[PDB]
Amino acid sequence: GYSMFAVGIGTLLFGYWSMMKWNRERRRLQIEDFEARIALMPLFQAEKDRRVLQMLRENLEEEAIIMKDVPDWKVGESVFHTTRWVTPMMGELYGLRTNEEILSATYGFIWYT
Amino acid sequence: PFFDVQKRLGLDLDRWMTIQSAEQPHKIPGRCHAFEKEWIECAHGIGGIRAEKECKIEFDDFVECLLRQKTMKRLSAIKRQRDKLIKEGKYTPPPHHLGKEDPRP
Amino acid sequence: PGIVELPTLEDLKVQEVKVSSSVLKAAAHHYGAQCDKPNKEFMLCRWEEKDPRRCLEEGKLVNQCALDFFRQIKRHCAEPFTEYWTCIDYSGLQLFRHCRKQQAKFDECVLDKLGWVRPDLGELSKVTKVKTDRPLPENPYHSRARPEPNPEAEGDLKPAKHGSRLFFWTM
Amino acid sequence: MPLVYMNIIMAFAIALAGLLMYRSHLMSSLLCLEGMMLSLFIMSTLIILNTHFTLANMMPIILLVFAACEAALGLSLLVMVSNTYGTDYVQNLNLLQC
C-alpha cells in the first residue's frame, strides 16, 4: 500500500521536473523564432504595400479603359466620404482576375492541410 | 429602468465588449477600427438627437466599411461592363488578369 | 466622394529580394542586427502615416539595405550560409534547433570576417527609438472638425417659481 | 448582403415557423427551438468572424450554454407532461382556458 503510492508520487515528481525543464526550453526557442519573424517583418510589409498598390493601379487602368463609354462614371472614384487610406477589400484586389487565384487568395490558408 | 451601477462604482462589468475599438487581446484591430473611432469621437457628448444628424457622414462611412454595399455595386457595374465589352470583342483583357503576370514578392 | 490617388507603376518598381523564406529565416538575426535603422524608420513611417502611399521611399531603402546585407554575405562566405539554410529548408516547420552546427559555423564566419555578433535572446523584440527628419503628421485620420458641444449648465439654483405649478397644487 | 446571410436568416424563419405551427408532439417543437438556437449561433459567428471583432468570439459559446439550459428545462417539463398522460401531445395541455 505505502510502497505503491510512494513509487507513484516519485514517478509523478520526476515527470514534473523533466517537463518543467523541457517546457522552459520550448518557451525560449519560441521567443527566438518569434524574434526572427520580428526581424523579417519590415521587408514583408514593404513588399506587401507595393504589391497591393500595383494591383490597385492595374485595376484602375483596366477600369479606365473599360468604362470610357459609360457617360457619368468617375474613374477611381471612392465610395467613402473620408480621404484617408482604407485597406482594400480583397474583392477589389481580385475583382478582374481568374477564378483559380481568387480561390487561392480566399481559401488557400483554410484549405491547406 | 437602467440603474447605471457600473459608472457609479467604476466597475466595468460589460463595457469592455460593447465596441469594436476597445482594447482587444494582443492589440488585434477590428476590420473597421478607424471608422468606428471617428464616428464615436464625432458623436461623443452631443446627444443622440444631434449625433443622428451631425455625424451622419462618419456613420455612413462606418456602415460602408461594415457591409461594403457600395463597393459591391461598383464592382458589379465594372464586371458587367467588362462582360458586355468582351462578348462583342471590343475589349480584350490583358495578360496579367488572365494568369500570365510576372509575380513579385 | 473624390478620386483615390494611386502611384504609377514606375515608382512602385524596386530591386526585389528574390531569396526564399528559409534563406531569410537563416539570415534573420544578423539581418535585424545590421539593417535596423532603415527598417525602424520605415516602420515608424508606417505606423505614423497609416498610409502605404506615404512610405514608399523608406520601403525602397529597406530593400536596398537588405540587398547590401545579402551581397556582403555572398561576398565573404557563401558556403557556410548555404549549408545552414539548406538544413533550415529541410524542416517542414523550419526549426532553428535542428541546425545548430551549421549555425555555429555561419556565426563564426560572420564574426571573424565581418565582426557580426548574433543578437541575444530578448534583444530583437525591444521597443527602440528612431530619429527622423520626417515631420509628425497632423491629422493622419483625416478627421473632420468635431461638432461643438452643448454649451453648459451654469448659475445658482433657485426654488421653482410658484412651486410645481401642477393643476391645482400651490406647492 | 451575401446569399449565405439570407440563407441563415431563412433557416431561422423556417425554424420559428416550425415552432409556431404545432403538430401533436412537443418534442418536435423542442427540436424547432434548438434549431433556432443553432441558426442564431451560425449567424452571430459569421458576423463576428467577418468584422474581426475579437472579443465577441466568446459570445456564441455563451449563447450555446444558455441554449443547453433551455433544452434541459424543456426536456424536464416534457417528462412531467408524459408522466401525467403517457404521451407528449400538446392536446393534453387544455385544463386551462382563457
Next chain:
Amino acid sequence: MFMINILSLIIPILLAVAFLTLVERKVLGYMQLRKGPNVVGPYGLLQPIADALKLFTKEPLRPATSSISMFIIAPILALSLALTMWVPLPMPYPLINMNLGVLFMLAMSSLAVYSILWSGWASNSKYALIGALRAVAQTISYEVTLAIILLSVLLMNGSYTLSTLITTQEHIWMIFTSWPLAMMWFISTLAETNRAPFDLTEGESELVSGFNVEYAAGPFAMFFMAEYANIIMMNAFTAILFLGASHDPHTPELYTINFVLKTLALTITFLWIRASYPRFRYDQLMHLLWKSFLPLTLALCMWHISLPIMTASIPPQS
C-alpha cells in the same frame, strides 16, 4: 498524388482489421488453452479472407418491419467514420494536418454513436432497441469524463495539434507525468469502443446480438470492420498521447516502426482484458464513470491547470 495517399491509408487499415480478427481469435485461444484458427491457411493466415468472402457472398436480408433508409445508412456511416478517424493521426506526418485534431477526433467519435443508434432503431426489433438504448447510456456515462481527461492531458502540450505531441514527449513519455489520467483514459477508451468489460450494446449473452441482431452478410461485416478499425485507431491515439516515440526528420521510418509496435501492444492489451474479466452491468458503468472517474478527473483537471503556473512550465504556441 493525394488520392494515392488516401488509398495507401485506407487499404492497409482494412487489411490490419482483417488480420486483427485472426490475432484476437488466436490470442483468446491460447489464453484458453487451445490454438484457435490454424487450418485455413498456414497458421490460419487465410482465415480472414475466407470469412470476408463468405460474408460478402451470403444473402443480406431486409427485415419486413424495418425502416430501410436508416437500416442501410447506418453501416455506411459506421465504416466511413471509422476510416475518417485516421486522417489527422501523425505517423509521424499526418495525412491531414489540423490545428485542432483532437477536437476533430472528439466530434467524429461523438458522431459515430449514431450508427449504432440508427441501426438499432431502424431494425424495428426489441433486442436491437435495447442495444441502442444501452449505447445512449454508455455515451452519457463516458463522454464528459473522456473530454475532461483529454483537456487535462493536453494542458501540457500547449495546443490541440496532434503532431505537437511528438515534440512535447521528446525526452520523457507523458505517461510519467499523468499516469492517473492515462489509467482512466484507458478505461474510457474501453467504454468508447464498446469493448469488454463494457461490450454492453452487443451483449451476446444478454441480448443475442444487441443492436445488430437483424444484420447479416455485408452490412454485418461492415459493422465489425468499423469496430475493429476503431479499436486500432483508439489504441494508436493513446500511444501518441502517452507513449511518445522519438522522431528523426531524416529517418521517419524509425518513428513509424516504434509507433506501430506501441499500438500493437495496446491492442493486444485490449484482447487480454477481454480474455480476463466478466462484463459490467450498464448502470454500474454509469456509476463507475460518474461517482469515481468524474470527481478524480475534476480534481486532476484543477491540478493540471495549476501545475504549469506554479512551476513556471507553461508550454508555447498560444
Next chain:
Amino acid sequence: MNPIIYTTLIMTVMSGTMLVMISSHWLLIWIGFEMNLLAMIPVLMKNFNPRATEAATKYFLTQATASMMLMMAIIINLLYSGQWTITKMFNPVAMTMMTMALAMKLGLSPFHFWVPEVTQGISLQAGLLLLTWQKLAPLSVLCQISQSINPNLMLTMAMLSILIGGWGGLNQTQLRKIMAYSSIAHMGWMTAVLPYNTTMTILNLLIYITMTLAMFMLLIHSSATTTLSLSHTWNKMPVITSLMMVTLLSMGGLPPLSGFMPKWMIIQEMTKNESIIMPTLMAMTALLNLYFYMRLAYSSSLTMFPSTNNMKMKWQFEHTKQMKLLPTMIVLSTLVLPMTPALSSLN
C-alpha cells in the same frame, strides 16, 4: 420544495431582473432574461399538480419563443451596426422584432393568450410574483429604447391590450383570471404613454404594482380563488372585504383614489402631443375593467351572500401568519392622490 432552495430560486429570479436593469450590453440583458426564466419555472410548479405543470409548460414555451426573437433582433442590429450597447436600434426590422419579443414577454395583445391560463394554473403567491415582478425587466428595456419604437405598432398593441383586458375580464368568475385580464389592460395603459414619457410609464407601473400587491395579499389572507369562495369572507372577516372593496374601487380609477392618478397623468401627457382620440377611447374602454371590479365588489362586500354552517368553527381561530406590508400597501393603493406632484422625483 426546500426553503433554502426556494430562497435561492427567488434570489436568482431577482438577480436576473437586476442584471437586465443594470446592463449596458445586449448579451447581458439577454442572459438576465434567460436566468430569470430558468429560475422562474420551478417557482410556478412549487405546488405540484397537473395544472401547475401545464401552466409552467405554456409559460416556458412563450418566454423561450420571445427570447429567440429577442436574440434575433440583437443579432440583426449588430449586423447593420457593430454595436452591442442598448441605446437605440439602428435597423427598423430589428426594432420591430425586438418590440414584438418584448410585447410577447409582457403579455400585450395579441400575445396575451398565455397570461390568464398561467395565472389560473399557479398558486396565488406565484401569481403575485408573475404579475408584479416579471414586468420590470421588459418595461425597463422598452424604456431604454423608447425613442426607437415605432409609435403605430406600440399604440395598436396598447389599445388592443386595453380592449381585450376589459372584454375578457367581463366573462370571469375565477379571481386569478380577473387579475390577469386586469394586468393586460394595465400593461396596455403603461405601453401607450411610453413613446411620449417614460416617467409616466414608471409611475403607472409603481401604482399598479402597489394595488396588485394589495389585492393578492388580501386574496391570500382570505384564501379565496373564486367569486363564491370570496362571498363567504364577510361572515368571517368583514374588515377584509371592506378593504378589498375600496381597493377594487381604486383599481377602477375612480377619483379621489390613487388608481385615478396614473390615467389622469397619462391622458394629460398625451394631450401635450396632440393625441385626443386615443386617450378618449382608452378611458371609455377602462370603464369595462371598472364594471367587472364593481361586480366583484357587489358579490363580496356591498351585499351579503349565504354562508355555511361549518363557518362557525372558523369563527374560533385567528390568522396564523401576518402580512407586515399589507396595511402600507392598502394605504398606498388608496390615499396618495394629494401627493401627485412627487412624481417629479421619478425623472
Next chain:
Amino acid sequence: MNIMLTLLTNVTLASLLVLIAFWLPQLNAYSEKTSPYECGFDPMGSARLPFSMKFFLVAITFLLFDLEIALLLPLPWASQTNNLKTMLTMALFLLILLAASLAYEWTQKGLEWAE
C-alpha cells in the same frame, strides 16, 4: 479541399461495399425469413412502443455538463495570458461550481436510476 475529398472517398467506398453486398449474392427472400427475431416466437407487442428510461435525470444533467466542456477547452490558450492570477481564479471557480453541482445531484439521489 483535401478533407472533402477524403470524406467523399470513404463514403463512396462504404456505399460500393453495400452495393456489392446487395447485388452479388443470390437472394431468396420470403415473409418467414424477413420476420422480426425474438429467439423463437412472434413478438407480443410492437418494438415502437414506449421504452421507459430510468436514467432520464442523468441524461438531462449530461446536457448541462456537456456545455461545461465547451467552457473549458479554451484553457490551453487562456494559460498564455499575462494576468494569470485572474484566469486561474476563474478557471478554478468554474470547475468548483461543476463539482458542487455534481455534489448537489449526488446527495439529492439524482444519480440513482428510477426504480
Next chain:
Amino acid sequence: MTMYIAFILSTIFVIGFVGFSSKPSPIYGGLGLIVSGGVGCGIVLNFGGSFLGLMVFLIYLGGMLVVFGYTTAMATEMYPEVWVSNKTVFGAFVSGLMMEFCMVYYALKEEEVEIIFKFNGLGDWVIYDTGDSGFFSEEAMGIAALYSYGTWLVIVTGWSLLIGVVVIMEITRGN
C-alpha cells in the same frame, strides 16, 4: 463565383432546417438537425472559425443523443412518420423547399429587397479582409479572452449552470 461551396453548404443547412421543421417523427427531426449542425460547422470553418464550428457540432451531437433517448422513451407511436407518410408533413417539406428555391432564384437572377435589404450575389469571397500577419489564431485568442476579460460572463454562466442543475432537480421531483 468561387465554386459556390459555401452557397451549397448554406442551401443544405436550409434543407435540413426544413426537414426538421416540417416535424416528422423526432428520430428524423433529430437526424435533420444533426445534418444541419454538420453543414453549419462546415460553413463556419470556411470562414476561419474552426473551434466554433467543431464545438457547436460536438454540442449538438450530444444534445441529439439525449433527444433520441427521450424520443424512444416518450415521443414514439405505433407508426413513426417520415416525410412521405403524411400529407401535412410532405406538404410542409415541399413548401419549404419551393420557397427556398424561390428566394434563391429571386436573389441571384435579379437584385431585390426580400424582407430587410437586397442582395446581388458575387459569392462570399468578396467580403473577406486579406489581412496578413500572426503566429496565432484570432478566434482562439478571442475565445481564450473569456478568462481574462470576461470575468463577469464566467460568473453569470457558472451560476446559471449550477442553478440549472438545481432547477431540473426540482422540476422532476413530482410529489
Next chain:
Amino acid sequence: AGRIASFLKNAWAKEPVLVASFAIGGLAIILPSLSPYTNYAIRINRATPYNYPVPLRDDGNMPDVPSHPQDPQGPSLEWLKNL
C-alpha cells in the same frame, strides 16, 4: 481534534477516491498562492513577442529607450536563460 481524525479514517476506509479528489483539488487551489514561480510564469508570458515592437519617435528626452536592439538599455531576458 480527534473527531476530524476519526472522520478522515472512516472516509479513507470507505471512499478513498473522494478523499484523494478532495486532497488534490485543495492542493490545486492553495499551492499557487504560495509558489514563487507564479510570477516567473507571468514574466515568461509577458516576454513572448507576438506582435511587432513599434519604434518610438526620438524627441531627445528618452534616456531609457535603446537606439538599437543590442544597446544596453531596455528589458533583458538574462533571467530567462538561467532558468
